[PDB]
Design a protein around this nucleic acid. Sequence first.
RNA 1: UGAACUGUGGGCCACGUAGUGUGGUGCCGUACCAGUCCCGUCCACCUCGACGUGUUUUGACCCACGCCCUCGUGGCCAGAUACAAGAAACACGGGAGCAGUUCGCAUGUCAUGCAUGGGGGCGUCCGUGA
RNA 2: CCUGGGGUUAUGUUGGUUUUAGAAGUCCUUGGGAGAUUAUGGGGCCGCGUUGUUUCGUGUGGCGCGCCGCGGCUUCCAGGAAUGA
RNA 3: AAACCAUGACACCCAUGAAUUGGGGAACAUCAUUUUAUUUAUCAAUUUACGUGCCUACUCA
Lengths: 129, 198
Amino acid sequence: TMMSVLANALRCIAGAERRGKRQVLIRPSSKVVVKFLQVMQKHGYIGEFEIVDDHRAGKIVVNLNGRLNKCGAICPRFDCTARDFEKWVKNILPSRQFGFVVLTTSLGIMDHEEARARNTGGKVLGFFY
Amino acid sequence: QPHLRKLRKLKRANPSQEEESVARVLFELEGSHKTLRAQLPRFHINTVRTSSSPRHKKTAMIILYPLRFIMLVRKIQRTLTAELEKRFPGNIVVLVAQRKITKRPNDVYKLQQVQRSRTSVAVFENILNDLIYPCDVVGRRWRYRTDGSKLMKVFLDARDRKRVESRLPLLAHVYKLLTHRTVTFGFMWNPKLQQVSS
RNA sequence: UGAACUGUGGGCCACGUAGUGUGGUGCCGUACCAGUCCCGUCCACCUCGACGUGUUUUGACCCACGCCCUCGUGGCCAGAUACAAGAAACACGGGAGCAGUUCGCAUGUCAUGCAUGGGGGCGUCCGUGA
RNA sequence: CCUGGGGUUAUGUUGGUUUUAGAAGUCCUUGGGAGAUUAUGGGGCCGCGUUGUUUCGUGUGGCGCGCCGCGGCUUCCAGGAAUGA
RNA sequence: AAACCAUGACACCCAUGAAUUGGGGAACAUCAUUUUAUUUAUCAAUUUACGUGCCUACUCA
Ligand SMILES: [K+]
Ligand SMILES: [K+]
Ligand SMILES: [Mg+2]
Ligand SMILES: [Mg+2]
Ligand SMILES: [Mg+2]
Ligand code: NA
């Protein structure tokens, strides 16, 4: 059965961008999925997306602009101390010049660059570049 | 005077002009109308509010009443609003029930005990149903633009277009005034297949 | 190892942005529609009373910077609405180095009596939690 | 939330008898304002008869609402507030 | 056991043309009797079309 909604959604987006599609449909939706997409959109990696209501878990349609190379989830959600950001950047990112690691902290869901500014650790959710 | 029985007990000592005018119309409607003669002697309102904007030249009149009479009002609506509009030219009359909202607690144990009718999401969507009552929502979408802006759109059945389209710009203003949230409206011919009118 | 949900607000200026719709203002040249005349019957042209395109402001999205909000509705203009067991409601001089902070005369004199003269925070116990 | 009823101190000190009041519970009653779900739900005692707003181009055209029945009494009754599938 | 697909179970995405096995919808048969729109268009407001053979001198509409 399906055990992770976030992992399912990120696999659908990465698969569609590999095939050069313009839109992708994601089902089911969740609060964590929407927050993850808002971080990607703020940095300019996807574009506009829309949520459709069906009185159950919703559906999401995402528009892709072709700037996203790969996104993925990290399972299980390992803890990350504020001094451990460099270790994760070295392991799962193409370089130290671009790309983001997404964390869930007591201040909310954010990328690793913002978390370093606020000096907070948390649990690693995923990445995109 | 007997017409003051249509107001809540606290407002009876020193009523406002708008509340007094509405109370007078309701009492006259009590003994005159045929259908409204029943189910009216059990009804009394809380307060009356008035809103307007430089655009939407018509004036909005909002009437709030206790939540107990929601079953009474539902059967009576589509007729009470028609007669009240006749006696108040230049105004559009809206009937909304007064509801309470429980602030979201922080403990998981406290959250499990919250009554779901007092949730903010549930209350706001019920106020929307109190507006445009004879029609019903056939769809709802949320749009997230490239900038942080977020929009909510509500679709209505296109069969009721001739009877509700004139009041849509004013009803969105009232919804913003009561909930501090913005809503956009659309019409859907064939809601089963999600076909948007144009 | 295990699906979704209770929820992240709004105003007022300012001014460099700042996307969109709705209306203002003038509008060379081009294009479109409607007229007039004219050729053709299988394939072409003229001249006008408007719509466009392009300006320039309004206005709603956006970021930066200040202020404000009982910071949904309602209810006041000290109580209630919510929140506070770091809370409320009782009480203890053996409780605060003299019973905390705020709107020379008296007692005693056989005395070293050489003594003594609204509301909010302190300490210590007892009832109140779902 | 309120007002009118009922049925441990302090008297100079210690030790004994006796009370007046509180408070509590416990039944009636007045004042007031609330309610997240309509006192109008059941019988019988029965008897009678079976032109005013609102769109849309002054005006036209659309506008929506309106233009076993009645009857007094009585007793019993909480039975609608629950995220969605 | 060459107990073989020499390929563990559950869940997601995934391009194309001919076929096939079971069920259903449309069709056949049986009954019953939106505005618009003179000056339009950026991802359409309706591609839903179509007949045959057998059949009471009944495991049958
Ligand atoms: K074997
Ligand atoms: K089969
Ligand atoms: Mg979960
Ligand atoms: Mg099920
Ligand atoms: Mg083997
Ligand atoms: Na084999």
